[PDB]
Paper text:
Recently, we described the remarkable decade‐long persistence of human stem cell‐like memory (SCM) CD8+ T cells specific for the HLA‐A*0201‐restricted [name] (YFV) Non‐Structural protein 4b214‐222 epitope (sequence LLWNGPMAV; hereafter, A2/LLW) in the context of YF‐17D vaccination. The specificity of peptide‐MHC (pMHC) recognition is conferred by the six highly flexible complementarity‐determining region (CDR) loops that make up the antigen‐binding site of the TCR.
We were able to solve the atomic structure of the A2/LLW pMHC complex at 1.59Å resolution. Electron density around the peptide was unambiguous. The general features of the binding are similar to those observed in other peptide‐HLA‐A*0201 complexes: the nonamer adopts a conformation with central bulge between residues at position 4 and 6 where the side chains are protruding toward the TCR, while the peptide termini provide binding into the HLA binding pockets with many specific interactions. Thus, the A2/LLW complex is very stable when compared to other pMHC complexes that are also recognized by TRAV12‐2 positive TCRs (Tm / ΔHvH 66.0°C/‐610 kJ/mol and 63.0°C/‐380 kJ/mol for A2/Tax from the human T‐lymphotropic virus type 1 (HTLV‐1) and A2/ELA, respectively). The overall conformation of the LLW peptide binding to the MHC molecule is similar to the ELA peptide thus facilitating the modeling. Five peptide residues are pointing toward the TCR: Leu1, Asn4, Gly5, Met7 and Ala8; and these predominantly contact the CDR1α loop. In particular, Asn4 extends into a polar pocket of TRAV12, where its side chain is making a network of hydrogen bonds with the side chains of CDR1α Ser32 and CDR3α Asp92, as well as non‐polar interactions with CDR1α Gln31. Alanine substitutions at each position of the LLW peptide revealed that the central region of the peptide (positions 3–5) was key for TCR recognition as these substitutions were deleterious to recognition; in particular the Asn4→Ala4 (LLW‐4A) was very informative as it completely abrogated the response of the YF5048 clone.
Numbering used by the authors:
A (entry chain C): 1 to 9
B (entry chain B): 0 to 99
C (entry chain A): 1 to 276
The structure:
């Protein structure tokens, strides 16, 4: 299951 | 910017036997950037029905792909893989050696 | 043995040619189980292993939403990074991201990781403690400060120690018949004379899983890399792997050489010796 929270650099 | 030239292996899935169905593989690895042209060749002509794996990468961030096709080896037929990449001054053609 | 779940993402910009290419792939150990490719027909997350096919529409809908969110983040990142490094619009650039978790033999959390690269080099990584970042250069320091302000590590650690390991365990149980199996290498040696004074010995390892393997030649029990040749381990295409290692030896001295094979699938390492 993927992470739900990537954040822009 | 980094550029890395591809390593290429051309081999069969199973030991080669004339008249027995098999898969011919062209494994390209260690390259960057990701744009790469890979064709499998039969007696110098491109094979259309070739599949490929999903792009992935190794611990050093270099990319790898497997290209493959169903085929039946015969006495007469020669195979090769043709690879083009930004690091190559001309496309590289690697012959299938049936014992390797 | 231990296991892992890893996701790999690549994003590539296309100067003068619109939206970036985006490819995502997920793995349990060395077995791919899902993919997403922006060039493909479905525009959904898709199954690539039998055991994940049983997950219901809520899983597929959810994974599609989340993978599209990854894609959208990377599209923003390619523009931001082009700005940070003041790169021209003419060139293609690449972002890569990998994250995942490992568990031990008891299937309990062992470690977690998250690595990000721009144009094939480290940009920012999560430290082993899962609480702070390592930035590769001055532009990545900007990102580190943003991510500290938004408490990214905290929520990423929650995923890496929680959700990641819980879902890995589910996958291991559902895919048990193929994921918790090791395929020991099938091994053999070939001999080819080169001349009256030399011959090649080649040690083969075929049909093995997982991919990790060590093949080494010894002469009179001493490690030998002079006059040796090793290929990279390569996929067979059927979910197993192949490798070979070769040495050129004097004619009549073949029996002084041994090939040593180490693999998780073997109860003890193998020693092979050429017997005419």
């Amino acid at each position: 299951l993927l992470w739900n929270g990537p954040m822009a650099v | 910017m980094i550029q890395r030239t591809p390593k290429i292996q051309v081999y069969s899935r199973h030991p080669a036997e004339n008249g027995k169905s098999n898969f011919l593989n062209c494994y390209v690895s260690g390259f960057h950037p990701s744009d790469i042209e890979v064709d499998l060749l039969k007696n110098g002509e491109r094979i259309e029905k070739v599949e490929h794996s999903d792009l992935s990468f190794s611990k050093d961030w270099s990319f790898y792909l497997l290209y493959y096709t169903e085929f039946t080896p015969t006495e007469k037929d020669e195979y090769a893989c043709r690879v083009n990449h930004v690091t190559l001054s001309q496309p590289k053609i690697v012959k299938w050696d049936r014992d390797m | 043995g231990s296991h892992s779940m890893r996701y790999f993402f690549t994003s590539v910009s296309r100067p003068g040619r619109g939206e970036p290419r985006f490819i995502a792939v997920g793995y349990v150990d060395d077995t791919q189980f899902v993919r997403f490719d922006s060039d493909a027909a479905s525009q959904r997350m898709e199954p690539r292993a039998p055991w994940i096919e049983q997950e219901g529409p809520e899983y597929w809908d959810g994974e599609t939403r989340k993978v599209k969110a990854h894609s959208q983040t990377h599209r923003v990142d390619l523009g931001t990074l082009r700005g940070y490094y003041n790169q021209s619009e003419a060139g293609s650039h690449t972002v890569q991201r990998m994250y995942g978790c490992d568990v031990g033999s008891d299937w309990r959390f062992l470690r977690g990781y998250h690595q990000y690269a721009y144009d094939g080099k480290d940009y920012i990584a999560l430290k082993e403690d899962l609480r702070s970042w390592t930035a590769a250069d001055m532009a990545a320091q900007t990102t580190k400060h943003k991510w500290e302000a938004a408490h990214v590590a905290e929520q990423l650690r929650a995923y890496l120690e929680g959700t990641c390991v819980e879902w890995l365990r589910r996958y291991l149980e559902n895919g048990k018949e193929t994921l918790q199996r090791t395929d020991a290498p099938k091994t053999h040696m070939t001999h080819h004379a080169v001349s009256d004074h030399e011959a090649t010995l080649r040690c083969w390892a075929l049909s093995f899983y997982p991919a990790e393997i060590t093949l080494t030649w010894q002469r009179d029990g001493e490690d030998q890399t002079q006059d040796t040749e090793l290929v990279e381990t390569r996929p067979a295409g059927d979910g197993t792997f192949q490798k070979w290692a070769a040495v050129v030896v004097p004619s009549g001295q073949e029996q002084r050489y041994t090939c040593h094979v180490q693999h998780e699938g073997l109860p003890k390492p193998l020693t092979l010796r050429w017997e005419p």
